[PDB]
Design a protein around this ligand. Structure first.
Ligand SMILES: C[C@H](NC(=O)c1c(F)cccc1F)c1nnc(SCCOc2ccc(F)cc2)n1C
Ligand SMILES: C[C@H](NC(=O)c1c(F)cccc1F)c1nnc(SCCOc2ccc(F)cc2)n1C
Lengths: 306, 306
């Protein structure tokens, strides 16, 4: 007896799902050009249902907002509209957080209840390399203390206060640093998706996850994430690393097998240990845990018992 | 702004709430039967309205349960009813948590959506004095490490899993210790209230508050709380301390002068520090913060914007 319902992949296909509202060819196009780490079978059989499951909660938080406002005789100090519904997305580097976020954003924005869905990466809340150097934490990029937690907290709080205007800084993966001066503006969306390694981590006081209405954790076998991590690394040689402006240009010249070495080293000494100390223990805090099998398809969902 | 809708006492009284919810005289017996200090006007003017708020939340959760269950063609592994709705009640020692919890228990039960409302204090999860001693922690009773946190977590998880049956141990303030083989059974209530000064405290992993659907923080000026503390202590000379078995019998003979000295020393050195370092930091993690005046009246409410 546990606090979630479990479905393996069989049981999930095998359910009398209520709604048609299927994917028009206008949508199924935009969808190939952000996934491809995700196939449309997955979008149809897995992510769409999820999006509706989530739609149910956003819709419920919208009705309750209103039922409450009416109950109070909609007083002056109550805001005029529900505040954004914030969804957190967590998991290891290379697990697919980013795609999953992009897909959900796309699907969730299909309903008229909540057409404005924003997306923000916690990447923009890393200290700039300048500062990471100043605090002697370069070797520590991606661990809890490498982020400006205070600013991140300030940001999410600002969003849940019903600001019409909240700013987050941008991180460039190419340049391996915060793009100075660049800012993402978020103007009271209906839903904000916040993605990052750290979104379900546990501060001493208030923490960002305290302002989440729903949170999702992307899980895989640790060997499999290594495999995905390495493949992503190799691939970056010809793309990202190829650029002369890449902090990691000197990785471009690596032969396949030499790059495989380097990758498994960066994995075994930074990314795997981070996952084990800081990310994987946050798995049981998610509303929903999705497990992906060796080749990226979901083979198990855990929804928190409603 | 803040993430809070804020009302003071005036504003809160002066609201048109378009259901005239009235307490029966059948209910005004029970609510005097919970004791005194208890101001019946405040039950009518504050706690009943709040009870309606919290009700709107429980009703939303029960419907959302159902719409989700429908959506999944009600599968076998989905539970049949909603799991209990959990509400945390935190705040200092002597701030009146226990009353607030007891009144709420009584008012929430009046609706037929959730007539079964259980109340459990986390004092039952303090380590027995015996164990507090093997661990050299008697001086630290009421701080985080004096609780069997693991046990507390299993308890709460069992209730949130939807189990039919869950035990908590019972603590006696009379004997100043856990009563051996005393047990409180909780049998899938519609709502469980969990009162304790630690309920909103952070764990590094999963933590109890992760299972709350709603939570309350009873607040006051720290000087005011001391004064209440000091009376509770004095008054205890007649009641608790007066029995010759009571661990604190010697305290019955302290004159108003020596009794105050003693109370302030226990405050200044145990209860006040536990509050500054462990409880007050938890205050911004509550859905609702209730602030009290010197004279025990509620003078400010902060609800988390919906
Ligand atoms: C430790 C470090 N940090 C990050 O790049 C990082 C991240 F990948 C994600 C979020 C925050 C971060 F600081 C790192 N991880 N891998 C590398 S080298 C390869 C470049 O980045 C990749 C990122 C994801 C991959 F799957 C493969 C490579 N570095 C320099
Ligand atoms: C810190 C400590 N702990 C507790 O007894 C206690 C509690 F009162 C409540 C919950 C958990 C606890 F460990 C304590 N605080 N005051 C005392 S001695 C005086 C008798 O207890 C009182 C309890 C509550 C009061 F408001 C005033 C006095 N002790 C032993």
């Amino acid at each position: 007896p546990s606090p979630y319902v479990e479905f393996d992949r069989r049981q999930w296909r095998a359910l009398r799902m209520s709604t048609p509202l299927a994917l028009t060819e206008e949508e199924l196009v935009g969808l190939r050009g952000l996934g491809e780490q995700i196939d449309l079978l997955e979008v149809e059989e897995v992510y769409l249902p999820l999006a509706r499951l989530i739609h149910l909660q956003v819709a419920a938080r919208q009705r309750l907002f209103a039922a409450t406002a009416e109950f109070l005789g909609e007083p002056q100090q109550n805001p005029d509209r529900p505040v954004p519904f914030i969804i957190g997305v967590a998991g290891s580097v290379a697990v697919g957080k980013s795609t999953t976020a992009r897909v959900l954003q796309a699907l969730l924005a299909r309903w008229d209840h909540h057409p404005r869905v924003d997306l923000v990466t916690t990447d923009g809340f890393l200290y700039p390399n300048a500062e990471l150097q100043r605090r002697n934490l370069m070797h520590r990029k991606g661990f809890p203390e490498s982020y400006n937690r205070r600013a991140l907290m300030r940001f999410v709080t600002s969003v849940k206060s019903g600001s019409d205007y909240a700013c987050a800084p941008v991180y460039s993966h190419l340049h391996y640093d915060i793009i100075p001066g660049a800012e993402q503006v978020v103007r009271h969306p209906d839903i904000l998706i916040l993605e990052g390694l750290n979104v379900l981590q546990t501060g001493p006081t208030l923490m960002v996850s305290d302002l989440f209405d729903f949170s999702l954790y992307v899980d895989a076998r640790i060997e499999d994430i290594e495999q995905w991590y390495v493949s992503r690394f190799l691939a970056m040689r010809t793309t990202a690393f190829a650029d002369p402006e890449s902090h990691f240009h000197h990785y471009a010249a690596f032969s396949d097998s030499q790059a495989v070495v380097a990758a498994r080293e960066i994995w075994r000494t930074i990314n795997r240990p981070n996952l084990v100390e800081n990310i994987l223990p946050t798995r049981p805090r998610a509303t929903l845990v999705l497990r992906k099998d060796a080749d990226h398809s979901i083979n198990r969902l855990r929804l928190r018992k409603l």
